[PDB]
Design a protein around this ligand. Structure first.
Ligand code: K2V
Ligand code: K2V
Ligand code: CL
Ligand code: MG
Ligand code: MG
Ligand code: MG
Ligand code: MG
Lengths: 194, 194
């Protein structure tokens, strides 16, 4: 019933552009929206986010997260490891590379989502959520070597999966950080299950 | 260590703006970023709310109540948690219960309310509270729920069992052109992983 009529460029930066979208509502009334898009997509999606399950025998399973200064937020955020998918990369492979660059961990693909939207009221940004287990007992993950590209400054924070939500709430209360909504959603459902 | 130096307007719409952010990196070097922000945020603790609505009924498996809407930024239909912006002076909890009723017809009870969490911190400053609400579907008020959408809001309600949410979401994605929201997918993945 609904569809895009036209998109007017309002402003293009190097990384992000702003558009005026004209669309047909289900009545037959023409309406407008202000949309954002990244200029970097071709791809299955703009990016990947990695859910990295760190498994070490005789330890709690942990979820590996990253803390970074985020200039749109003017502050530090706690997120799943994540980045853009390179021209001609599969989402799986983008996931293992990002996880290594950002955390030093080398992991295994467990499962891969379809393309899912980041903030559909605002942007067309999409990611694949890639679940990855990390054999924390293998020698290659013993002393993880993070390989951060230019201008990435990443702190690695591992939290137990079985208490994820309480541990994040504690970091927020103590450290003036913003947790990522996907992280929080995941943490919430771990408590809401069963 | 890192902090904002300046924020320069590039382009302001009625609803969304684009800014050039200058910040200090942890090496002591100036860098820039392109930041999106919504024009509607005032004194709220966040831009919006998303509602995790747990529909409870005697002799029924618990359902998660979701909404399907056309999203002009995406050029297509998206499956999301019920959600909207927080009105000036409104509490996140009030916004949540109101949005939930407007979009779905259901009258919820507050369970919990997150701190403000970021939607896409590499792109925007946009934040929400994620509000978990239970719906007593045995209450006569919630028997034949009537949406009360606002102007230009066109919503379909989809209720899926919590105990099979991820497979049911995948089935819907198999049947049509539609994108699942990343928070919904994250929550569904955690329910499997638990
Ligand atoms: C119903 C009407 N008051 C309205 C119309 C469009 C929008 C909007 C939101 N985000 C991006 N672009 C446009 C908000 C409100
Ligand atoms: C590596 C460095 N040239 C760089 C710097 C900034 C960004 C960026 C991304 N999204 C929005 N705004 C800015 C991407 C890359
Ligand atoms: Cl897992
Ligand atoms: Mg990253
Ligand atoms: Mg990266
Ligand atoms: Mg809404
Ligand atoms: Mg609404």
């Amino acid at each position: 019933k609904q569809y895009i009529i036209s998109e007017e460029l309002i402003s293009e930066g190097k990384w992000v552009k702003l558009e005026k979208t004209t669309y047909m509502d289900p009545t037959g009334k023409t309406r407008t929206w202000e949309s954002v898009k990244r200029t970097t997509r071709k791809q299955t999606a703009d990016g990947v986010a990695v859910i990295p399950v760190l498994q070490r025998t005789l330890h709690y399973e942990c979820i590996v997260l990253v803390k970074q200064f985020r200039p749109p937020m003017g502050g530090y955020c706690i997120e799943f490891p994540a980045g853009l998918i390179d021209d001609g990369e599969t989402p799986e492979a983008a996931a293992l590379r990002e996880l290594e660059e950002e955390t030093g961990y080398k992991g295994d693909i467990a499962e891969c989502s379809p393309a899912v939207c980041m903030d559909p009221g605002l942007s067309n940004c999409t990611i694949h959520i890639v679940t990855v287990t990390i054999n924390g007992d293998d020698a290659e993950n013993a002393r993880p070597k993070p390989k951060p590209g230019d201008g990435e400054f990443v702190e690695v924070i591992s939290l137990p999966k079985n208490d994820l939500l309480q541990r994040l709430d504690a970091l927020v209360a103590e450290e003036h950080l913003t947790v990522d909504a996907r992280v929080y959603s995941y943490a919430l459902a771990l408590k809401h299950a069963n």
